[PDB]
Amino acid sequence: STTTNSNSIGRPNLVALTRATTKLIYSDIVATQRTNQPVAAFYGIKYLNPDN
Amino acid sequence: IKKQMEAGALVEIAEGMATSIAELQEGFNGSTDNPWNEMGFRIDKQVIEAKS
């Protein structure tokens, strides 16, 4: 009675890979705009009263 | 033993099974204790790592 124990398996099948990447949230949390100089400058323009 | 075969005391032989026993092999007609003869196979592997 030749059972399955007589047979020898070969290379097991590679069913599925599994990588782990965080649900990155930075294209939604912040406002991005590429700068064309190594120094980036933001202008803050404000409206004041006679009391500043 | 090989020396005996030259002397003719023992000679090779190969006979066939009697028909009555052949019919009643492990079962049929209520006979008991007379099994068949079974043959199978085994599959064993070898592994060859590569050097450099």
From Swiss-Prot, chain A:
Homopentamer. Interacts with the portal protein. Interacts with the major capsid protein that forms 160 hexamers. Proteolytic cleavage at the N-terminus by the prohead core protein protease gives rise to the mature capsid vertex protein. This is Capsid vertex protein. The gene is 24. Belongs to the Tevenvirinae capsid vertex family. Capsid protein that self-associates to form pentons, building the capsid in association with hexamers of the major capsid protein and one dodecamer of the portal protein. The capsid vertex protein self-associates to form 11 pentons, building the T=13 laevo capsid in association with 160 hexamers of the major capsid protein.
Curated annotation (Swiss-Prot), chain B:
A proteolytic cleavage by the prohead core protein protease gives rise to the mature major capsid protein during virus maturation. Coiled coil: none annotated. Belongs to the Tevenvirinae major capsid protein family. Homohexamer. Interacts with the portal protein. Interacts with the capsid vertex protein that forms pentamers. Interacts with hoc; one hoc molecule associates with each capsid hexamer. Interacts with soc; this interaction reinforces the capsid structure. A total of 960 subunits of the major capsid protein forms the 160 hexamers. Major capsid protein that self-associates to form hexamers, building most of the capsid in association with pentons made of the capsid vertex protein and one dodecamer of the portal protein. The major capsid protein self-associates to form 160 hexamers, building most of the T=13 laevo capsid. Folding of major capsid protein requires the assistance of two chaperones, the host chaperone groL acting with the phage encoded gp23-specific chaperone, gp31. The capsid also contains two nonessential outer capsid proteins, Hoc and Soc, which decorate the capsid surface. This is Major capsid protein. It comes from Enterobacteria phage T4 (Bacteriophage T4). The chain holds residues 212 to 263 of 521 of the full protein.
